Structure 1
Amino acid sequence: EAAAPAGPKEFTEVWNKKAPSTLIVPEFPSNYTAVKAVGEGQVHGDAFPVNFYTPHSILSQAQKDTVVLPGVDGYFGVKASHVPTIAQLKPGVVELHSGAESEKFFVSGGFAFVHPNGVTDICVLEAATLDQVDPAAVKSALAAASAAQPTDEFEQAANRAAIELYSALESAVEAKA
């Protein structure tokens, strides 16, 4: 049931009647969004558009053919037309593929959507590629993390996040192929 249809078209009339007529109607982030979810397209075969995102940088916006993402239930590959999903991610390696060649960014968390028009959206807070990490620091940081376990369970939640991320990173650096 959708008898109360909020939206950019349906904010405009209540604004034009209530707000003063000197002002132009305020913009919306939907006006700056060119591609959407429900309206189909964007696949045209074996390609599908991958938008890999961080708050500080836009890591990829090209089209790919498979991406493997570290979900909470383990890794999973997204082919050209996956089922629509909202997959929470755990610390692991996001791997893009455009064909024979691949780029592997290690991520810290985040989510990953793929939409009913086949466009996928990987939304993480910090993604550093495996060249940028040195393995001598993650071993000592996990040693300092898996040692001190305070009884204040906020800090043990932070410790669990630490040992999860550092352990998946350590397994992510001997996993060269």
Structure 2
Amino acid sequence: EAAAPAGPKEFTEVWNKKAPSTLIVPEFPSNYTAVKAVGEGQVHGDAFPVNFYTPHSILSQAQKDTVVLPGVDGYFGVKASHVPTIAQLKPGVVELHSGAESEKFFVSGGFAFVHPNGVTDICVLEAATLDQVDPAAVKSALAAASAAQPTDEFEQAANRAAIELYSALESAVEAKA
């Protein structure tokens, strides 16, 4: 079932038999991270490491004690020793709580992994905070997105993604604390 014993370590001594001997081995993306999945530990009680990422930003890499994630089944929350989870997220608000303070980022969709060591790895594309969203032009395009209904199924999918994004964005600009 695993007849290809791959890995960064095994690639080294095989590459020393086909390449010229003048070149050092290429690096791998495993050599640039110490935080693994099955590496046991990484919780110490109540606050767990939350690596909330972005292609253009690292929005938080310190620890929080509960993260409210907007999954496609619905909003869920992650405690310290949560079950391992690969959660696809809807457009919704990722809420980071470490205690009494709470930051709310509205994300565009993108997965969030809970690894067996308890590290949460939220991975979205556009994660704007709710301070820099406008409540005016969202319905100006949502009422436009609730109008253009073509038979083209490619644009029908993009209009469906246009509807549910502004529908969850308006629902999370009405009920703010």
What's the TM-score, normalizing by structure 1?
0.98
Please give the alpha-carbon distance, in whole angstroms, between the structure 1 residues aligned to 2:7 and 2:158. 39
Q: How does 1:20-31 map to 2 (within 5 A)?
A: 20-31=20-31
Please give the alpha-carbon distance, in whole angstroms, between the structure 1 residues aligned to 2:92 and 2:175. 11
**After the TM superposition, which segments of 4 or more aligned residues of structure 1 sit over 3 Å from their partners?**
none
| Correspondence 1:89 to 2:89 | yes
Please give the alpha-carbon distance, in whole angstroms, between the structure 2 residues aligned to 1:117 and 1:58. 21
Please give the alpha-carbon distance, in whole angstroms, between the structure 2 residues aligned to 1:18 and 1:94. 48
Cα deviation digits, residues 56-114 of structure 1 (max 9, x gap): 00000010000000000000000011100000000000000000110000000000001
Q: CA RMSD in A?
A: 0.7
SS in 2 for 1:103: strand
Cα deviation digits, residues 104-141 of structure 1 (max 9, x gap): 00000000001000011000000001110010010101
| Correspondence 1:19 to 2:19 | yes
SS in 1 for 2:17: helix
Shift of 1:172: 0.7
SS in 2 for 1:109: coil
SS in 2 for 1:37: coil
Q: Tell me, which stretches of 5 or more residues in structure 1 are unaligned?
A: none
Shift of 1:150: 1.1
Shift of 1:5: 1.2
Q: Tell me, which stretches of 5 or more residues in structure 2 are unaligned?
A: none
Shift of 1:4: 2.4
Structure 2 partner of 1:110:
110
SS in 1 for 2:149: coil
Structure 2 partner of 1:176:
176
Please give the alpha-carbon distance, in whole angstroms, between the structure 1 residues aligned to 2:101 and 2:67. 12
Cα deviation digits, residues 24-49 of structure 1 (max 9, x gap): 00000000011010111110101100
Please give the alpha-carbon distance, in whole angstroms, between the structure 1 residues aligned to 2:6 and 2:135. 51
SS in 2 for 1:86: strand
Please give the alpha-carbon distance, in whole angstroms, between the structure 2 residues aligned to 1:175 and 1:123. 25
SS in 2 for 1:31: helix
Please give the alpha-carbon distance, in whole angstroms, between the structure 2 residues aligned to 1:138 and 1:150. 21
Shift of 1:3: 3.9
Q: How many residues align?
A: 177
Overall identity of the aligned pairs, in %: 100
Please give the alpha-carbon distance, in whole angstroms, between the structure 1 residues aligned to 2:104 and 2:37. 26
SS in 2 for 1:135: coil
